[PDB]
Scaffold this active site. Structure first.
Site: not given
Ligand SMILES: [Zn+2]
Ligand SMILES: [Hg+2]
Ligand SMILES: [Hg+2]
Length: 255
Positions: A60, A90, A92, A102, A115, A194-195
């Site tokens: 992901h 990580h 996004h 995000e 993040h 957020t996941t």
């Molecule tokens: Zn994140």
């Protein structure tokens, strides 16, 4: 769960009912309604002794892992109480430069969002931290497309090695100080991961100042696969969750 039409954010509630919880993240940061709080202490980032170990494609995103068995890389101050240890970072990103982040600012979307995840040491391990309302601290930095970010190149170059889901590579001596903006001014609010499992354990620290990356650097992110090796290719892009209702919460500013 993923980010497709059949397994996207809009479906997550079925498996994780907390998805429509009370303190969900990411959210839109309305710069006019945010409350300047003078009682906010300056952030304290101590990453001089950080120890990176590896990077891996989890299907992901890609995670850069750090040794969190000692207070090597810590975050303290600001709105926090106690020391939080760096465990991973990580990003996004989007399929285009006009989407990817995000969090949004006055509805503005950035090319990507970094993040830096940290856990509260009074809890002994990450796994127990995610059982507390104050278990995590995530430092969120926005990426805009412009000049190249020197400090990010080490990561870009290794992506070739972890193209599909489940691949990992040794990744030592990476200094996360190379990814931080000049200014540490920020907005903060209580939220969630957020996941999946979207657990409501996070104190969000979003920096006002974005870092710029070049077109070529972000292009490499977009070359990653969601799929495992030997499977139909699905490009890892738009691995972001849309903004969620603020629901009474108040966003505070350190400036
Ligand atoms: Zn994140
Ligand atoms: Hg969590
Ligand atoms: Hg929690």
């Amino acid at each position: 769960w993923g980010y497709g039409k059949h397994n996207g954010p809009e479906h997550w509630h079925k498996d994780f009912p907390i998805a429509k919880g009370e303190r969900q993240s990411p959210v839109d940061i309305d710069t006019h309604t945010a409350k300047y709080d003078p009682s906010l202490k300056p952030l304290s980032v101590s990453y001089d002794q950080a120890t990176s170990l590896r990077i891996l494609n989890n299907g992901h995103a890609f995670n850069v892992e750090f040794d969190d068995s000692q207070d090597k890389a810590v975050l303290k101050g600001g709105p926090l109480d106690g020391t939080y240890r760096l465990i991973q970072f990580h990003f996004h990103w989007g399929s285009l430069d006009g989407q990817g982040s995000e969090h949004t600012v006055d509805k503005k979307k950035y090319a990507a969002e970094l993040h830096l995840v940290h856990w509260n040491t009074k809890y002994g391990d990450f796994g127990k931290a995610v059982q507390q309302p104050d278990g995590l601290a995530v430092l969120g930095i926005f990426l805009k497309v412009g000049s190249a970010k020197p400090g990010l190149q080490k990561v870009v170059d290794v992506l070739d090695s972890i193209k599909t889901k489940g691949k990992s590579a040794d990744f030592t001596n990476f200094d996360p100080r190379g990814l931080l903006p000049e200014s540490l001014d920020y907005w903060t609010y209580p939220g969630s991961a957020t996941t999946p499992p979207l657990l409501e354990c996070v104190t969000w620290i979003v920096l006002k100042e974005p870092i710029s990356v070049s077109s070529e650097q972000v292009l490499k992110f977009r070359k990653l696969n969601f799929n495992g090796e030997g499977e139909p290719e699905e490009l890892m892009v738009d691995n972001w969750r849309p903004a969620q209702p603020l629901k009474n919460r108040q966003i505070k500013a350190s400036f």
